[PDB]
């Protein structure tokens, strides 16, 4: 029972079970032991459970959020936890933190045919939450435990150009919260290279985090273009359970008063991205947090220097268009009838995709797109062809987001 | 050219070719003179046109709307516009104003295979005008002169009666803007019998129009249940383009924490009324309006008493799913899994559709439910069977109504 | 246990059961006191179980269905030797079924009080005991009438005209003492027989969603005229709720509009096919799934219109179309005709309206025999658009005959069934 | 404008083509001469329209029906009767039917180039009458307007002995049996392998005034079944009737049980994209009720016995003959449709007479209880006694 | 656990079971005794189980291929042989293959309410054994695994033909040619109607080990196609060839060129619900290659040429054989998928061929240039060459 307490028993249980793993196939490599199936059969390296009941991994990890939600529960319904082990053994490619150091074939296959290793026939239980923290690393250059809360999304290395400088300058004023900055690389920041030109080689959804002493600070992932690797960072993302994401990206304006440089603040989403119609029907709706709505319409405004319900002029709300086709314009008129019936006011590549990953995984959402061209009205040109006026507007883009993660985590 | 000019050409237009079909067709009844082929080649009885372009048909009804629109475009882009006749000829079922003096067989077939009749395989055009126009008094038992823009939706007639009480009580009051009352039965009343035991029975849709000088009154419309002729009430109100109209309806809450009596914010719907589905397809999402959501948000506050989000007790806002199905309860399990990936805050029969067809005609909607019952968790009872804690706050759920209703007209 | 022994218990033990609880609720409400976790698990307020023999149910309201139950007992006993047993079930009534229809709301001490301490409705022969309380809870609601006045013949309309000569018909019938027919149940409670002053008032639109009236006779082999508004939604409700009454058959009498060029408005539509466009019962019942029609009833609505009407050959050739009829949700249907049009033709569609297809799907999924006569009310293809209610003579003038075929076949089937 | 000449000056302008069309080719075949392009525009090879709109083709056969049907127009309204030459040129083969020639597709390449080729109106029913000789081993002319459909050479057997019977004995008003290769009986002759020469072989009773029976052994499955329909459609039959067995699905029909359709489960497929599933396909009253009587004679029973061998109810077809192998997937369907009985061509002979206003039925005898584990010649006899009743009533 | 005698020994079990079937059965037709209750039980009909785990039936002609397959799992990897009774009892129509009753359904009304009935496993294969012998009027145990599918009767005698030249000269491998209606021929005897009694009739052409050439003539539609190799299937054939006219699409093509399919537009329709059109089916490299060269041989093309009467592509197999009436909608797709020829069984054969993981492959023959207007002996030598070479490289 009690908070403090079986939070111990966990990373009790838990390291019991990872070095115990961990001995057992070193046991097995250079010597070929095999280990005792009754030890086994009672935990001799499974998952510590918890009930009060879903099973655990890295509680050292989710320590603080495990107690913030642990007491906030026996100092108001006096429930018990009879933290222990439980039927799930740990697959042995977790236990090996760091890289693997490889044998033959005929040995690999004896880890296969004797250990626990990956069971796809199986919210977030260990098994779930591990396979996103290995992911995670790998996809970001970084570690899970860097990760701050308030993440940002892009899909211009511009902005992480920006963001990286920024941060630095912010490093270094002592009256500013952030301490450090962890790099997609793998190197730490304190008080002119963080930006290293084989992070985007190495790793495709590049992280920046501006960590802070209370740990809540400002992540920036660059997730790419498609909404199919935007579905696939939010999968990981979801078990460090952020308090919000935004999308900060560039898009296609579709109504004639826009320009370049606009923002598009999206109501609802026209999903034409696929990607997610079999966990989420189309006509299953997706919609906007009143709370993140108004941080981002404020922090237009706030930045922007449009007075009152001025900003009305160079930011539109309505809904957006998210499609896994870039080159719609090929198929205008097909995409005529949808764009109009759902009276679509901007086109992007990852927007929804975003949104209802934030809508499945309980995690606030939204969407601050900058209009980079007018598709449907000549004036053709996208981001990194020079328009002095999408580009002389990304620090400003940029700025609205991070306004917006202060005004969010003000509340 | 000119504002206060071609709206009188309208009317004369208009006027022209109305009485000189009600003429012609008089001179057909007892006499079988026929019209003359080239006057009427010519625009005998043809409906006004106007460009600067799209028919139109009692001007004298539209006129301060056409003018409202008409100058706000002459007093800044210059326009001309040359008001004349068009091709397209008035059917005489709507120069008949009022009844129907029938003729046998024979004559009434002579109508048809001489005169302009309606004509299905032909925004807003003339005819479509005509056609809502003599709908709408036919539904409601009022006239079309007396609506207002600012229209609440019932399917209670408990909420009649208390919005006829207020409503005369106002008529009463010097401190009123309300001068009037129109009733559902053709009645007007000014400075005890408002209500018919008649109109019930011969309008399935009455309505209650409390008027003002200026026309800015609020109107009630008693649509009934069902998706389908809440979908068709819209069709014809949207050609008196309202300012807004709200669904003040009563609901089925689906969550544990609600209470009989509570409140529900629509902020998205699960479209499974099917009645829409053909012209505005369940993929298309309906987006909530940041003005309404406040007027009604802020409403349910005043009213209420709960101070500053206290109201988030009694006051939840969620996806609402709108269904043809009365007895969905019969199919809980089959419903179960999409009212979870919704997850729908309650369940009703109207909103979806009215939001849906708000959303179609550029009308501003907005849907403030009452949980008037708790079908996943006992306490089983709809309105009408004693429920002391929904009916003992019905005075409230319409005056939130109303509140909103002013909110909106402040601006 | 004999066939009527087994009717006496479940009478007696429901009754038992209901009274236990409307009891137990009272002590809750004010000595605050409860009931026994033993008693109940013993059956306290448990509906009584009706097994034979193995096929077995839940039953309630047994004094209501005492006709219906009796005849199905006493054949499978007397004709099969079987064995009836009847006692406690093992499913509580849900409190709110034993309230009646109003009751004393008061405070949280209450609402979420009971429902905390007593049987509540939880989701998840044909139809066990909570299902048809359900149904007989909203009957009660929907019609404004009792339901044990509903009588085995149902008639179904969506136009007030009907009612009002349904009520002519009536009031007129139970004047003549060697009429079968005895009284007439109105919607609202009222209740008109031979010594009933002023039956002239015999509101309702307003307090009744659906209003019924009830023309019974000593024997419930009467007719019931139940108005169900427009639109497909209130057609499958009143159906799911008015098939657990078991009715003989229930017969569709309203307005439509003829698609045919050569159709006149007062003219008749039996139909023989439905293109099902109501969208309200895709989900159980697949539009793939063909509704056809039964011979009898088709028979009895074809000889009814004969008779009734006084129609020779040759008139009944052109005045009375058989063919399919086309029921749709959207009454605006006409704003979109060009998506229609191809649909109609396919169908070879005869006529239009909005709860047909929806009232004999519904028959068919509950075994209820059903049919449709339906009068073309207008033409909306061809020059003659009106909604019912505005001036037109022509059928205004059908109504009468309209409802009188009904009645008719009605009175043509409840005389076959030997 | 007169109904009757009319009608010969339209068969006067098809010959006109006809004899134009062959000249021409037979010309090309040998001294290799190509017609005037400019005649051709003259309306040397078109058909000959009609008005009152529409191009018509062998009139000749489609006399009765021809007159009979404008007369109605004229005696009943008077209609402006218009019959000239079409902007539509007769198909170069549609016109082989007089000859038969042996060529090559080369000695064709002209034939097409230069001709005119195939690239209900008169190029559809000329599509039609073609084939229809093809797939049957008989001509055009001996169809009777009552026909029965048949999946089991049982039935044609039992049916071409009947026949004969007929076609000798005087009293009958049967007098020559059309047989499936040319063949040609008469009540003066003697008493094979069309099977192997034919997809979809038939067999006339013709009568003098053409009213007598006519059986057409379709194949098997919903493929054979629209097919033959498409071109039967053409001679405007006043009825046809599918006689088939079928599988039983409830355990209370016996094997050698009728089956009497009232509605049916469209799973056959083929005509899902001209009429999707969802248009429903009623049942002929006069049709069932004839083939009801039908029953209730020649069975011997009361009028009450008959309901204990003949059951009413809705039939499934389908293109899947070995279903049983997935059953556990049917299910759900046969149940919901209250499913009767199963075969593969009943609701396809129904819907294809539904599209082309053609009274239809179907009479199945029970073959198999594949849901259970477990007579011709009176099951032919009634579909006979039930064509000969709707002849009377008509 | 014997890889031999354990195939002996189910072949026990099921003459074990068999015998006490029929036995039991041909007693309560006379005494009307029924068979002890607690003997079925104790496993006196079921059929004999396998573990290596499934039951097996006629063990007898799957001899062959089952020894030289559980071989493979012995020689190979040392499996467990089991060989028991199993819990299923055989449905008693499958065991009538010896004597043929008579009598009726109430005669039968207790063999099926007391004996057991039917209501690739033992129960699968049983279920086309049977009905294989009576779409064709030949016995299961003269199939040969290479098989030749058509819808040409003229294709039929061209090979009845062939095969009896085959019979007789000592050369050639082919000894005796099963026909359709039991009839077997040798090379001492001398030279039907199978047409009228067969839905389907085959034809084999034996050889001593059972490696000779089997021609099953399919009727029209992919119904009868998808039907027939349900039932082959349970041969295991090493592969199944569709050779058939088709319409050609293309305006290069000329009537008698030869179309083979690189894929297949399924418009059949019959094997969606088990098999999705979006599941692709491939062609067999070593098939495709095999009919090439069988065509590049037979034709006299020295290795170019054959491209100029030769062509690939993606085939489309329709249930309509109408679909001109309605071209205007198929284009579309025609266009979309490239086609070149259009026929009605080609896709379903291969299908059902993927399905059961049978080599497969199609050559049709361009019989009509339905969009433009406008031989035999040989495509079937193209035929049996192709089959000769696959038999060769295996």
Not at 191 to 204: F, N, V
Not at 274 to 281: K, Q, S, T, W
Not at 327 to 333: A, I
Not at 344 to 363: H, K, L, N, P, W
């Given at each position: 029972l009690t908070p403090e307490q079986a939070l111990d028993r966990l990373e009790e249980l838990y390291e019991q079970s990872v070095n115990a793993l961990r001995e057992a196939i070193a046991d097995y490599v250079?010597?070929?032991?095999?280990?005792?199936?009754?030890?086994?059969?009672?935990?001799?390296?499974?998952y510590p459970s918890l009930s009060v009941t879903t099973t655990v991994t890295r509680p050292a990890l989710f320590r603080a959020?495990?107690?913030?939600?642990?007491?906030?529960?026996?100092?108001?319904?006096?429930?018990?936890?009879?933290?222990?082990?439980?039927?799930?053994?740990?697959?042995?490619?977790?236990?090996?933190?760091?890289?693997?150091?490889?044998?033959?074939?005929?040995?690999?296959?004896?880890?296969?045919?004797?250990?626990?290793?990956?069971?796809?026939?199986?919210?977030?239980?260990a098994?779930?939450?591990?396979?996103?923290?290995?992911?995670?690393?790998?996809?970001?250059?970084?570690?899970?435990?860097?990760?701050?809360?308030?993440?940002?999304?892009?899909?211009?290395?511009?902005?992480?150009?920006?963001?990286?400088?920024?941060?630095?300058?912010?490093?270094?004023?002592?009256?500013?919260?952030?301490?450090a900055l962890s790099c997609a690389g793998g190197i730490w920041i304190t008080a002119e290279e963080a930006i290293s030109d084989l992070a985007w080689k190495k790793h495709q959804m590049p992280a920046w985090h501006?960590?802070?002493?209370?740990?809540?600070?400002?992540?920036?992932?660059?997730?790419?273009?498609?909404?199919?690797?935007?579905?696939?960072?939010?999968?990981?993302?979801?078990?460090?359970?952020?308090?919000?994401?935004?999308?900060?990206?560039?898009?296609?304006?579709?109504?004639?008063?826009?320009?370049?440089?606009?923002?598009?603040?999206?109501?609802?989403?026209?999903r034409d991205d696929h990607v997610l119609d079999a966990?989420?029907?189309?006509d299953i709706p997706i919609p906007s947090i009143a709370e993140v709505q108004r941080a981002l319409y404020d922090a237009t405004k706030a930045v922007s220097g449009m007075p009152g319900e001025e900003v009305k002029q160079r930011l539109?709300?309505?809904?957006?268009?998210?499609?896994?086709?870039?080159?719609?314009?090929l198929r205008y008129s097909a995409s005529a009838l949808r764009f109009n019936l759902s009276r679509a006011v901007a086109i992007d590549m990852e927007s929804a995709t975003i949104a209802a990953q934030g809508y499945r995984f309980?995690?606030?959402?939204?969407?601050?797109?900058?209009?980079?061209?007018?598709?449907?009205?000549?004036?053709?040109?996208?981001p990194g062809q020079a328009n002095r006026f999408y580009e002389g507007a990304i620090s400003e883009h940029l700025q609205i987001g991070?306004?917006?993660?202060?005004?969010?985590?003000a509340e």
């Amino acid at each position: 029972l009690t908070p403090e307490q079986a939070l111990d028993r966990l990373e009790e249980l838990y390291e019991q079970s990872v070095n115990a793993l961990r001995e057992a196939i070193a046991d097995y490599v250079d010597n070929g032991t095999l280990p005792d199936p009754h030890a086994r059969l009672n935990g001799l390296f499974v998952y510590p459970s918890l009930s009060v009941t879903t099973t655990v991994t890295r509680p050292a990890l989710f320590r603080a959020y495990l107690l913030e939600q642990l007491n906030l529960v026996y100092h108001d319904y006096g429930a018990h936890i009879a933290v222990e082990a439980s039927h799930h053994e740990i697959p042995y490619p977790y236990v090996i933190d760091g890289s693997a150091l490889t044998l033959d074939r005929s040995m690999s296959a004896g880890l296969t045919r004797h250990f626990p290793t990956t069971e796809l026939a199986q919210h977030f239980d260990a098994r779930r939450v591990d396979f996103s923290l290995a992911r995670l690393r790998h996809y970001t250059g970084t570690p899970v435990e860097h990760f701050q809360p308030f993440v940002l999304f892009t899909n211009y290395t511009r902005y992480v150009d920006e963001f990286v400088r920024w941060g630095c300058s912010q490093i270094l004023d002592p009256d500013s919260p952030y301490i450090a900055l962890s790099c997609a690389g793998g190197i730490w920041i304190t008080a002119e290279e963080a930006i290293s030109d084989l992070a985007w080689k190495k790793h495709q959804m590049p992280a920046w985090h501006l960590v802070t002493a209370d740990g809540q600070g400002i992540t920036l992932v660059n997730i790419g273009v498609g909404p199919s690797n935007a579905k696939t960072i939010c999968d990981h993302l979801a078990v460090l359970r952020p308090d919000v994401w935004l999308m900060i990206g560039h898009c296609g304006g579709l109504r004639e008063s826009q320009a370049i440089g606009d923002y598009v603040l999206a109501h609802a989403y026209l999903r034409d991205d696929h990607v997610l119609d079999a966990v989420l029907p189309p006509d299953i709706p997706i919609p906007s947090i009143a709370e993140v709505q108004r941080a981002l319409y404020d922090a237009t405004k706030a930045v922007s220097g449009m007075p009152g319900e001025e900003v009305k002029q160079r930011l539109r709300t309505g809904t957006v268009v998210t499609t896994d086709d870039r080159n719609w314009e090929l198929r205008y008129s097909a995409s005529a009838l949808r764009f109009n019936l759902s009276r679509a006011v901007a086109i992007d590549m990852e927007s929804a995709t975003i949104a209802a990953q934030g809508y499945r995984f309980r995690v606030p959402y939204g969407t601050l797109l900058c209009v980079s061209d007018k598709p449907l009205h000549g004036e053709i040109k996208l981001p990194g062809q020079a328009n002095r006026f999408y580009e002389g507007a990304i620090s400003e883009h940029l700025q609205i987001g991070i306004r917006a993660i202060d005004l969010l985590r003000a509340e």
